[PDB]
Structure 1
Amino acid sequence: TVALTVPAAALLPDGALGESIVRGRRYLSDTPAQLPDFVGNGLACRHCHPGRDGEVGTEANAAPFVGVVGRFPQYSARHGRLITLEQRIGDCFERSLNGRALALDHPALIDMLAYMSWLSQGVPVGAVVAGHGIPTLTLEREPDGVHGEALYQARCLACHGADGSGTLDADGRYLFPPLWGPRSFNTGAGMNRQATAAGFIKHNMPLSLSDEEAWDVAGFVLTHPRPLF
């Protein structure tokens, strides 16, 4: 693998590309507000692809976009064929954002691509960046949702809510995003899979959990309704 590096925003070039990248960051950070026609719930890309200092998709084991462009096209079992990065973004619009894929030459989509390509500067095509994706967590027993409920109340509820509906900020963006219910990800999302949710939670939430705790609280989270895909 190669190291995960985050480029300096102060070395963004002047011109069309630089302006595109800045727009791309905003689309990824503020997606419901910026692309209402394509988003069907309360999630922005950054809610599962977080980053620091205003960037998006820069955190190891939270599916960083650093180095993503050199990994596409790639086979998708979902599609039964090779897909492009543009198509992969469409998938998370349709599933994680319970919405509609942008046209593959949509200027907002190209801006998102430009941003991901900026984050990926210097990464060799085909190389795997350390910390890519969301590592799954799988245990050799059923997740205990009763235990998970107790864990949720103690470790998650203060942010994500008794009803899993999250916490809005002053500008109407989710400070703490919804984990279930009508404004959360739909059943087609990867985050609706036990081992992916458990993996995400293990590596990223709160903010630490044992494997058993992550497994069990993920189970509890996924007992709830959410939009159907």
Structure 2
Amino acid sequence: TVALTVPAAALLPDGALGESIVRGRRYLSDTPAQLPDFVGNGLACRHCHPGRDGEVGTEANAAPFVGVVGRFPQYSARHGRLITLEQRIGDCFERSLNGRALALDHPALIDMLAYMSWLSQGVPVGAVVAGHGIPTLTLEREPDGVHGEALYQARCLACHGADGSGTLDADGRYLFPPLWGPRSFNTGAGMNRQATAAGFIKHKMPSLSDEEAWDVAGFVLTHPRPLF
């Protein structure tokens, strides 16, 4: 694998590409507000693909976009065939944002691609970046949702709410996003899988033990959310 690196915003090119990258960043950080026809819930891309310093998709083990463009096209078991990055983004619009895929030549889609290509600057095509994806966490026992409930109240609730509905910021965007219910991700999302949720929670919290991450993920995933 190659190391995860984040290019400097100060070195962005003047011109059409620079401008596109900037719009891309915004669509990824502010998605429900910038793309209302395509988003069906309260989530922005940055709520599962967080980043430091205004960027999006730059954190190891939280599915960073750094280096993503060199990994597509790739086989998708979901589709039964090779898919492009444009299509992969479409899947997260339909599942994670409970919405609709943008047309494959939609200029907002091309802006998001330009942003991801900028983040992938210097990464060799084909190379795998350290920290890519969300590494799964799997324990050899059932997730204990009773224990999980107690852990939720002690470690999560303060941010994500008793009802899992999250906390709105002053501008109507989620400061702390919703974890279940009608504004959360739908059942088709990868985050609706126990080992992916457990792994995401384990790595994004710093901190929880493996058993704790496993059990609280189980509790979160007992709740209703939109059907895909």
1:36-95 CA-to-partner distances (Å, cap 9, x unmatched) read 000000000000000010000000000000000000000000000000000000000000
Q: Secondary structure at the match of 1:175?
A: strand
TM-score (norm 2): 1.00
Question: Alpha-carbon deviation of 1:26?
Answer: 0.0
Q: How many residues align?
A: 228
Show structure 1 runs of 4+ deviating over 6 A: none
2:220 counterpart of 1:216 = no
Q: Secondary structure at the match of 1:42?
A: coil
1:12-38 CA-to-partner distances (Å, cap 9, x unmatched) read 000000000000000000000000000
Task: Find the aligned partners of 1:169 and 1:11 in 2 and give their Cα distance.
Answer: 31
1:79-113 CA-to-partner distances (Å, cap 9, x unmatched) read 00000000000000000000000000000000000
Question: Alpha-carbon deviation of 1:192?
Answer: 0.2
Q: Secondary structure at the match of 1:25?
A: helix
1:123-167 CA-to-partner distances (Å, cap 9, x unmatched) read 000000000000000000000000000000000000000000000
1:189-200 equivalences under 5 Å are 189-200=189-200
TM-score (norm 1): 0.99
Q: Which runs of 5+ in 2 are unaligned?
A: none
Task: Find the aligned partners of 2:143 and 2:53 in 1 and give their Cα distance.
Answer: 35
Task: Find the aligned partners of 1:70 and 1:52 in 2 and give their Cα distance.
Answer: 22
Q: Secondary structure at the match of 2:175?
A: strand
Task: Find the aligned partners of 2:130 and 2:118 in 1 and give their Cα distance.
Answer: 17
Task: Find the aligned partners of 1:105 and 1:171 in 2 and give their Cα distance.
Answer: 30
Match of 2:143 in 1: 143
Task: Find the aligned partners of 1:151 and 1:127 in 2 and give their Cα distance.
Answer: 38
Question: Alpha-carbon deviation of 1:226?
Answer: 0.3
Q: Secondary structure at the match of 1:164?
A: coil
Q: Which runs of 5+ in 1 are unaligned?
A: none
Question: Alpha-carbon deviation of 1:205?
Answer: 2.3
1:156-209 CA-to-partner distances (Å, cap 9, x unmatched) read 000000000000000000000000000000000000000000000000026x00
Q: Secondary structure at the match of 2:225?
A: coil
Task: Find the aligned partners of 1:205 and 1:44 in 2 and give their Cα distance.
Answer: 19
Task: Find the aligned partners of 1:142 and 1:182 in 2 and give their Cα distance.
Answer: 26
Task: Find the aligned partners of 1:170 and 1:219 in 2 and give their Cα distance.
Answer: 31
Q: Secondary structure at the match of 1:112?
A: helix
Task: Find the aligned partners of 2:220 and 2:226 in 1 and give their Cα distance.
Answer: 14
